[PDB]
Structure formats: structure tokens, C-alpha cells
Design a protein around this ligand. Structure first.
Ligand SMILES: [Ca+2]
Length: 240
């Protein structure tokens, strides 16, 4: 997250850290959202490689021990059937991970609330992006969870030539674009929390930013619109 601030230890309890085994150590690679005691929602392109993944909940400082973390393995990975590694602009960047064991809920670990299917936010709706991603284009990961105010930019505006144009589909959500704040590599798969009727709900899964940079004016961070996949998500958690 570029241009953000450190978040409160208990501000975003549904945020998780997806890490892969690097030799004999673990390295953070993406964010995600706990939607069930044993199910995590994240980005498909985050789990395209055949690596060994683990999920960390109750996490705040990636480098230190907060005394609130729970480490659990990933038993099964369910990528959306239409995902295409070579075409992130085609959409469908979403995946579900069944954890090896159910986690215990508390002040630091809670489930994220998903919006009703088909829900579309009005232009300039108040949302926040959170993550341990890069704090600068070509910089380094953050040590502590960061957050940044990132209002939405409706489809009509985001798909106009002055912004992302045709690269953006109606199955996506755009937020930010002020050239100062934005998501960055490492925030992918993480949530976009938006205030709706006095409650924060996860409306997006961080998907991509500009090849030319993370914080680029008129090039808002692009997210997978969660409300477009509610039926899919429910069918997976019920079957698998
Ligand atoms: Ca820690």
C-alpha cells in the first residue's frame, strides 16, 4: 500500500497473510480475507504457482511475534474455472482456499462480511485498502499492516479513455487514482473494505495496478467485484 498509514491491531480482523515456503522460511506474497472459519478468499493469480502455502490470521507485524497469530496450512485451492493466467484484464481473478483446520475467532480473527449479490457502489463511495504490500513502486513490503482511504470510481468513469478504458470490465471495481494512495505488489488478493449502511463489507479482492507504477494518477487500483461471485462462492463452500 502506497501512501497509507499503519492500522490498529484490531481494525481489520478478517485480513490474512498468504505465505509460501521459501527454503526453510516463509515469505508473504499476498493478502486475503477470512470468510469462514476454514475458508479464505483471495486472488487467483496469487495461487497460480505450485508452491506450498500457509495462512496467517491475527497477524500485524510480519517480522515480529505479536502473540495473536494462528498459523494454518492450506488443504485445497479452488480457482475460478474461467481464470486465465495470461489475461488478468479478462477478469475472474478470485480463488477460495480451504484451510487444513478451522481457526478460533476472537478480537483479532473475525470473518469478513460479503455484500449481497449484484451490489454496485455509487461513485466515490468510502472504502479502505489494507495490506503488507510495497509502500512504494519498486520498494519493499511493509512490516506492519497498512491502510489507505481509497474511494470508488464507477465503471462508467473507470472504463473511459481517460482512465483504464476497455481494460476494465463490469466485473471489477476501481478505487483511488489520486496519484498518492494505492495498492501495490503484495496487496493482491487482499480486501477493499467499503462502508455500506453503517457496516464495512468486503467489496473487492485486489487484482492489479498499472505496469508503469502503483500510485499513478487516473489509474486506480483494480479489484475483482466480489458481489459478482456470491453464487459461485456459496456453491463452492457448500459442495467442497
Ligand atoms: Ca507477527
Amino acid at each position: 500500500v502506497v501512501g497509507g498509514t499503519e492500522a490498529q491491531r484490531n481494525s481489520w480482523p478478517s485480513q490474512i497473510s498468504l505465505q509460501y515456503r521459501s527454503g526453510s522460511s516463509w515469505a508473504h506474497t499476498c493478502g486475503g480475507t477470512l470468510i469462514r472459519q476454514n475458508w479464505v478468499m483471495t486472488a487467483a493469480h496469487c495461487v497460480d504457482r505450485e508452491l506450498t502455502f500457509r495462512v496467517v490470521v491475527g497477524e500485524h507485524n510480519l517480522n515480529q511475534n505479536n502473540g495473536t497469530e494462528q498459523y494454518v496450512g492450506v488443504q485445497k485451492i479452488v480457482v475460478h474455472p474461467y481464470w486465465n493466467t495470461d489475461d488478468v484484464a479478462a477478469g475472474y481473478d478470485i480463488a477460495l482456499l480451504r484451510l487444513a483446520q478451522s481457526v478460533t475467532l476472537n478480537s483479532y480473527v473475525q470473518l469478513g462480511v460479503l455484500p449481497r449479490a449484484g451490489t454496485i457502489l455509487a461513485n466515490n463511495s468510502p472504502c479502505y485498502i489494507t495490506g503488507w504490500g510495497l509502500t512504494r513502486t519498486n520498494g519493499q513490503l511493509a512490516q506492519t499492516l497498512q491502510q489507505a482511504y481509497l474511494p470508488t470510481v464507477d465503471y462508467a468513469i473507470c472504463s473511459s479513455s481517460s482512465y483504464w478504458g476497455s481494460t476494465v470490465k463490469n466485473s471489477m471495481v476501481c478505487a483511488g487514482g489520486d496519484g498518492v494512495r494505492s495498492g501495490c505488489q503484495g496487496d493482491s488478493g487482499g480486501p477493499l473494505h467499503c462502508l455500506v449502511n453503517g457496516q464495512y463489507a468486503v467489496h473487492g479482492v485486489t487484482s492489479f495496478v498499472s505496469r508503469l507504477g502503483c500510485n499513478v494518477t487516473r489509474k486506480p487500483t483494480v479489484f475483482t467485484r466480489v458481489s459478482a461471485y456470491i453464487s459461485w462462492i456459496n456453491n463452492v463452500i457448500a459442495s467442497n
